[PDB]
Design a protein around this nucleic acid. Structure first.
Lengths: 203, 108
RNA sequence: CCUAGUAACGGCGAGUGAAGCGGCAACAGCUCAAAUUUGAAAGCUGGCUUCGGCCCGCGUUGUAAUUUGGAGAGGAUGCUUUGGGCGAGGCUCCUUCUGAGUUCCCUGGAACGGGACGCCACAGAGGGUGAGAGCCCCGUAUAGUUGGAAGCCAAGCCUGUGUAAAGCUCCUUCGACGAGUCGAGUAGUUUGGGAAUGCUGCUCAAAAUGGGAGGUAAAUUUCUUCUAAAGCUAAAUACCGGCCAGAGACCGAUAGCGCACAAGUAGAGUGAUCGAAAGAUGAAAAGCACUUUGAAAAGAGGGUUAAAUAGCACGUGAAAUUGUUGAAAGGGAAGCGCUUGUGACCAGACUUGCGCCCGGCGGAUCAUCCGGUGUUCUCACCGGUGCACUCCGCCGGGCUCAGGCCAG
RNA sequence: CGGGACCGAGGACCGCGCUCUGCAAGGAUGCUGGCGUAAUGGUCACCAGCGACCCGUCUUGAAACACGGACCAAGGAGUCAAGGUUUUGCGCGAGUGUUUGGGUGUAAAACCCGCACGCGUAAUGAAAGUGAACGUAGGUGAGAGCUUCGGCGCAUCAUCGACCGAUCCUGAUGUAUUCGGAUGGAUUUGAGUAGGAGCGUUAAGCCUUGGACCCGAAAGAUGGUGAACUAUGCUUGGAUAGGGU
RNA sequence: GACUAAUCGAACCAUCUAGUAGCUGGUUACCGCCGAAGUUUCCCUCAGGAUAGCAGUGUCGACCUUCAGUUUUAUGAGGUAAAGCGAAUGAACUUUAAAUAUGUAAGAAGCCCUUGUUACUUAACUGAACGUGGGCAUUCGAAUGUAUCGACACUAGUGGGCCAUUUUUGGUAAGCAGAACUGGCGAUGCGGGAUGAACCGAA
RNA sequence: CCCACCCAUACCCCGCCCUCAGGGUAGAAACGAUGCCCUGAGGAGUAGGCGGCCGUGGAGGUCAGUGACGAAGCCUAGGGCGUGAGCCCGGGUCGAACGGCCUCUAGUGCAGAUCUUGGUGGUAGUAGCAAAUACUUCAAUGAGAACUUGAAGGACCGAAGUG
RNA sequence: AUGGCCAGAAAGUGGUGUUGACGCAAUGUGAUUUCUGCCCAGUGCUCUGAAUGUCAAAGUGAAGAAAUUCAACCAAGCGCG
RNA sequence: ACGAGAUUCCCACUGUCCCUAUCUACUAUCUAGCGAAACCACAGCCAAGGGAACGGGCUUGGCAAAAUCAGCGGGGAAAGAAGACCCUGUUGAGCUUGACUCUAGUUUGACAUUGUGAAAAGA
RNA sequence: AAACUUUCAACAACGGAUCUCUUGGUUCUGGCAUCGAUGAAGAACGCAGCGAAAUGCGAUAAGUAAUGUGAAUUGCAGAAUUCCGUGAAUCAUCGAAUCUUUGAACGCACAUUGCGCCCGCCGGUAUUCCGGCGGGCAUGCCUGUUCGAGCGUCAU
C-alpha cells in the first residue's frame, strides 16, 4: 500500500531546518522572557480531566479557570488576565471536586503572588509592600504549578481486617446483571404499563 | 552503500456490518492476566510479600492507574489476599482471586 | 507527532481515504444590529483662522455615550480604583583603535621551502604577497574604547484628586439576540461521508425555550451540547519571487544554471518563440632593441626571461591523422597463436665473504674482585683493578668451506 | 646382463628395512672443464614450418538472412525515496524506540530529559460479547548432552489428551416468572493457550509504487501566433502589336 | 481533401511531458567455486496461463537413519522358440523350457502367537481392523557400491525445441506423419572423417 | 589374413597452480592460529547463483609520508612483479601539488546504442570550376596584371534594352 | 416576416437585409435536339381523423403514525386508422 | 461546332530502319590556379566442396611480379530502397452507418415571471 | 635498387584530451519586508577629450550637491596638490537634487516627432500679424461646494 500515484515529488517536505528552528524558538523564548521579566513566561492553567473513557483516568492542564472558580477564589474576572491567570468562559463546573481543586490552586497562586504598585511612590492596599517585594521567584508556571499527580496511585496497602466484603454474587455476575437490565429496561416498562392497563380494566 | 551492490559485480555482463463514524476510544479496554498481576507491585514490596514479611497487610492494586481495564484469568496466584480494582473482570480471574483470598472491586 | 493506511468509499477493482481524543510548538481576546440622551446630537467631514474659535454643512429614514449572552438593564449596599510630568540606567544601529621575526645559513629567478634561534596566541579562520607565511600586509579573537542619530524598555521620583467615570457583592422584576435566511424537494458538482459530506442553481419557504447538531430512513417521548444567517484580531505555519549573509563528504569549463567571458548576448524565425560557441603567456611585458634578407607576411642572427622546449596561433600538450629521417617487409589482403633463427636493444647475476693458523702493528670497554645503580631478583650497566701467553680492530701471507653462467 | 630418453619434488634426526665397519633403506650427489660476459636469459622487428572466418545483436532448435560498426578523444545507461519480506551483525530484553518537542552546547555536531504514542506482551466473533493450568504446564515413541550408570532427558518431530473464542443441541440452582446460562455433549474452525520474544538499528538479496536501466512512436490535451506564400471576397489603382472572319 | 509562409484526411509555437510501448537497439574490470532446461499435472482456445521437474547460496538436525535408473533369488507379463509325443492328449499338444528387457518383494522400523472389542465383515468368535500382552539377538537373515543424509529459508533461468537408434500405430505413386524410452545438441573445446549443427574416437 | 609403425587436451608417471576434504599445532622456546605443517581427491561451460580481489572521485584517522635538489599529467623498440584486472621502477618532457594503509561514501570502470559533442582520414589533387556569341595590341601603375586604367581595334544588348 | 436560412458563450448580439415569391435558400440534372416501358401502394412522404393502447416531470385521490406504497389522470412522439 | 482528351487508317514526307558514314561548337582529355561530397568492419582473381539450397575469409586446386593512365558497366558498392509489397499489433488517425454511451440544435409539458374583471361547469 | 604501400622508432606537425587552477554554478541554513499616477517594471534615444559593447548616468547626462576618507586616475593625451588642505579619486557613504521620448500612460492621436484647446510671460514696426517660453486640459468613483432640471411630494 504505497500512495505515490499523484505528483508526489512536487510537495515533498524535508526537515533540514529542524536545528535552526529550535535555535529560532529558543531565541524567541529568551526575548519573550526578557521582555516579560520579572513576570513568568506563561499563564497559570487549571487542572482538568481528559474526556472519553480511554483518557478519563488522567488529568492535564486546561485552557483557563472558570468564572465560578474565579468567583469562589475571590479574583475578579477583569483583574485575573492581568496577573498571569488564564480565563476560560466556556468551561463549566459540573462537580464539586474539580471546582475545589482549581479554587485551591488559585488560592495558592494568589498567596505566592507579588504585586508591584502601578506608581512606585503611591502604593495601594492591594499591592505588595516593598519590604516583602524581594524574594526568590519563579519564571515558569508550567513547572512550578504542574500536574503533580496526573494518575491515581497504582498501589496502596491495607490490613486484612479491613478488606472489603465485595459485591454479593460476584463482580462478573454484577456486570452481567447490569448489562441485562440495561438491555431490558424498555421491555420491563412496557410490560409494566400493559399489566397496569389490564389491572385498571379488570380491577 | 553502492560498492556492496550486486550491480557493481554485474558491471560488464548486463464482510459483515458497517460501522459509520467508528471511535476507538469507546472500545479501548486493555487486559492483564493474573500471572502478571504481581508485577504491578513495586519490586521491593513484592519481594517482602512473597517472602512473607507482611502477614498483617494486603495490597490494593488499581489496574486503571497502570493502564488496564479488564482482569483475565491466565495463570495462577499465590496464597496472598490481594484487593483488585478493575472496570471488568472474567469469571475465572475472579474465582482465582477469591481462592487466593482477595476481592475484586468494580470501578468506573 | 500520533490517531491511521484506520472508520469509510470503489466497474469487471485498479485504487482512494479523513476526524474526535492524546503529546507538543504558540497562545489573546473582542466590536456591532436589535433599547428613548429626550432635562436639551452630547457625534462628525470640510473652509477660514488672530489657533481662542467662527462658519458651510452631514445627520433624527439616527451621529455619540451605554449593552453583546461570558451577559446585561433596573434596584439595594458598603468599600475599593483612576490623571499628568521627569527619569538614573539598559538595549538596538553606524563609527576611531588593537599581538608577535621580514634574525642567521643553504637551494632558488623570487622563500612563503629546508635548517637554527626566538616571539605572540580569548587571534594557528580566510586571503594577498615573485613557490606550503600565526609574527610582511589586510583581516581574525576578546574585552572594551572614540563620535553621532533615532527609537524602545525601565529602577525610582515629583505633583491633581473625584465634577465625573470604574470594579466587587446580592436581588422581586425585566432580559430586545441577524429571513428569500434556515430548512425541504430537485439538478449538477464534490467528498472517505455512491444509507451519514460540502457548494451552487430552480421551486417551496419557517419558528419562538425556538433553532442547528448528536454520521441508517420515519413517528412518539426524552436527553446532551451549542446559539447560524453581521464583523475585527498577534503568535506558533508556508515560501523555486526580491534583498542581505553564512555554509557544504556537491560540480570543476562536453561538468556545474542556457550563461565562470560585452549571455538571455551573437544568430535564426513574419511571429508566438528558439537560442549557442567561447576561461588559463609570463612572477613581472621584461610582448624581441639593433643588423641582415624579402614588396609584404615573415625568416635568420642577436636579445628578454629561470624557461620562448611560454612569442598575444601563447600553461601542460594525449589520440585519430600528417611530414622528414633511420630500419624492415611486399608474386591477387594484412592482422593473430605455437616454436626456432637472424639483426637491433636490454634487465639481472658476478666482482668475493665467513672461519681457522702464523707474523707485524695500534689500544686497554680481557677473567676475577670491590662499590653504586637498574632489573626479569639473577642477570646486567657504570667507576676502580688487567700490565699484555689475556681481550678488540687493522695489515700481510697460507688453509678449508660457500660463492655466477653453460656444460662433460 | 646390456643400450637410450625425460625427470631430481623434499631439506637436521626420527620410519620401514637390508647384503649390517656400512647401504641403492621415508625424493641427487660426487668429480671436472670453459667462460665470467650480453656467453645464458629477456624485449622488439622480420623471415620460416604448422595453426587460425569479423566483431556485437537477433532468431529459432540451430545456421543462414538481417541490423550496427570510416577513425580517435571525452561523455554515456538497474539509481534514489517510501513500504514489505528473508538472512547477517549489534544493543537491550517482556519489554523496546533519546532526536514531534524540551534542556544544553566549543552551535545544523555532540551530550542530557520525560509525558504521551507505535510495535510486542491475548485471542476469537459479522456483532453484542466472552476470553486461555485436572495433572511437578499432561501421556506415549524418538532425540543432543549429562548421569549417582538406576535414569534425567534441550531443541525438534509424530501421535493422544487438556484449556480459550466462534457454530449447533440439552437446559441446573436461582428468579424483575421472565430473565439468567451452569452442566453435559458434536463438528469443523483460529499460524489461539499449553514455562513469553520482541523492539530498535546496520548490511545484503528479492518484491510493490514512483521518470524507475538508457534512447525511440503514430498520438491526446491546455493556452497562444500566423492570409508577406496560397485560396476567396471588398475598396482603390494599373496593363494587353498586327491580321482573319 | 486542394490551399491556409518549402509544414495539411486537419498549420505553427510553448506547456502538460522525462506521456505510453508488451516492439527495436544498447547496457562499462579481473579471477575463483558451482551450474540448467522444452505437454509432469490441471485449467475454452488463440493475441493463454499457472505448476511439477532440473539449479545456486545460506543454515539447522545425532550430516540420525543408510539407500541404489545394477545383478541374483521367489513370483508375474511375454509359454513365444525349443525337446518329446519308445510321457498323456492333440501357436491353440504338453513332463520340461527360451533370448530381449520389464512389474512386485527380499526384516528387529520385522515376523508371528495369544487376548479381547468391532461401530466392518462373516452362517458364525468367523476373517480382518482396532488395541492388549508374550515369544522371537545365536548369526539381523542375497550380491555389488556407498565424501550419495534430511528438513527449512531465500534467490534464478527454463518449463508444446532440433536430430538420431530401438519399439509401436497409421500411411503415400514416391516422399512420410504420430506416440514411448534412450542418447546427443541448443551450453562444448580436442584427434580423425580433405571440408562441415546431427558421423567415429574421446571429453 | 598377418607383422611393424604414426599420433588426441584420451590413459600412465613426475612437477607446479587453485578448489574441496581429512588430520596436527599452549602449564605456549609463542602465532599476520584470519598463521604454519602433513595427506588424499578433483579441474570444460551459455542462462543463472555465490565469493574474493583490482581500479576512479570525495570524507575521517594514520604513515612526525613524498615534493621547486621538481608534485600531478604525458611519451617511451627500457625493465620488475601479478594467472589476471593491474601495481612498481628507469629515461625524456613538465611545472604545484600528491600518495600508501584501515574504515566511510558515490554522478565509480565502455567497442558498439543508424549513441552525444568535438576533432581527423581514404576517396583525392579526384568530380568538377562547359547556359547568357569575344576578345586583341601598345603604354602606364605595381613585387606581381587575361579579368586595373588610358588610347587603339573587334563585337554584344537593339528602345517589351545589358538604356 | 411574431418567417426562412444561418452565426454567436451570451447580449438592449449579428448576417442574409439598402432584402419580399420575375425574391431568397437548398437540392438534383446539366447547351440544343431526343426524352418520360406499363400499372400500383410494401418501405417511405404527410393527415391536429378518432382513440387512450404506450405514456416522463409536475399535479390529484386512498391507506398508514410517518418514511412510503397503491391508484386513476396523463403533452409531444410512438401506435391505430 | 469546339478540344495540348483516347483510337484506327490514307496521301505527302523523311537516317525510324536496311546501314551506317561525315562535319561543327561545348565537354570529356593535358596543363596553371582553385578544389568537394556520397560511401567506407576489414579487404578485394577464380573453380569445386563447405547438410540448414549462402560465402570473400575455411579445405583442395588453378595460379600468382612493382608503380600507373584513359575508358567501361559483369560483380562488389550505389535508390532521402529504413522505398514499395506481405504479415503482426493493448496499434494511431480520417471517414460511414438504427454499432454503444452521450450531445449541439429542434420539439413538447410543468413551475416562476403573472396582474384586473366577468360568464358558465364542478366540488 | 628506388618510388609506392604497410610496420616500428625519434623529432616536427594537426588537434585540444589529461593534470592542476577557479571573482562561477548547485544545494542547504539564518535574517529582512521595501514597487507604482509624488508616474513603476519594461522599451527607445542620447551622455566620456579620445568607446562600438558591457558598466554607470540623463541635456546638471561614465554625472551635481552633502557626509566621510585622505593623495590619486591611468591605454594615451592634458592638467594636478599651495602637501600642512572647503581637498585627488573610474573612492566609499548617501538624507539634497537633476531625471530626454515613452510605457498602467493621462488633451485627441501615433505605421504621423501629426492636429488641438485654455491661461499667463517675452521678443520682433504691431489693438489685429509672426515667433518663442512657462503652467495646464484622460477615465471611473468618494466627500464637499456651486449652478441647474423635473406637478415627483408639498406649503404659500
Amino acid at each position: 500500500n504505497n500512495h505515490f500515484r499523484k505528483h508526489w515529488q512536487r510537495r515533498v517536505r524535508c526537515h533540514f531546518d529542524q536545528p535552526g528552528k529550535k535555535v529560532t524558538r529558543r531565541l524567541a523564548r529568551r526575548a519573550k522572557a526578557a521582555a516579560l521579566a520579572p513576570r513568568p513566561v506563561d499563564k497559570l492553567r487549571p487542572i482538568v480531566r481528559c474526556p472519553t473513557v480511554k483518557y478519563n483516568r488522567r488529568t492535564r492542564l486546561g485552557r483557563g479557570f472558570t468564572l465560578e472558580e474565579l468567583k469562589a477564589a475571590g479574583i475578579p474576572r477583569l483583574l485575573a488576565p492581568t496577573i498571569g491567570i488564564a480565563v476560560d468562559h466556556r468551561r463549566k463546573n459540573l462537580s464539586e471536586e474539580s471546582l475545589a481543586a482549581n479554587v485551591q490552586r488559585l488560592k495558592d497562586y494568589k498567596a505566592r503572588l507579588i504585586l508591584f504598585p502601578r506608581k512606585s511612590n503611591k502604593p495601594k492596599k492591594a499591592d505588595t509592600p516593598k519590604d516583602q517585594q524581594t524574594a526568590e521567584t519563579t519564571t515558569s508556571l508550567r513547572t512550578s504549578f504542574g500536574v503533580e499527580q496526573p494518575l491515581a496511585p497504582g498501589f496502596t496497602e491495607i490490613s486484612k481486617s479491613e478488606i472489603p466484603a465485595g459485591i454479593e454474587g460476584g463482580a462478573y455476575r454484577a456486570l452481567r446483571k447490569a448489562r441485562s437490565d440495561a438491555r431490558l429496561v424498555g421491555v420491563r416498562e412496557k410490560r409494566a404499563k400493559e399489566k397496569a392497563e389490564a389491572e385498571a380494566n379488570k380491577k | 552503500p553502492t560498492r556492496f551492490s550486486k550491480t557493481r559485480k554485474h558491471r560488464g555482463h548486463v464482510v459483515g456490518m458497517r460501522h459509520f463514524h467508528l471511535l476507538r476510544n469507546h472500545y479501548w479496554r486493555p487486559s492483564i492476566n493474573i500471572d502478571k498481576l504481581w508485577s504491578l507491585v513495586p519490586s521491593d514490596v513484592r519481594e517482602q510479600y512473597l517472602s512473607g514479611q507482611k502477614k498483617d497487610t494486603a495490597p490494593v492494586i488499581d489496574l486503571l492507574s497502570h493502564g488496564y481495564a479488564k482482569l483475565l484469568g491466565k495463570g495462577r496466584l499465590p496464597e496472598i489476599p490481594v484487593v483488585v480494582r478493575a472496570r471488568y473482570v472474567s469469571a475465572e480471574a475472579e474465582r482465582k482471586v477469591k481462592e487466593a483470598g482477595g476481592v475484586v472491586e468494580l470501578v468506573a
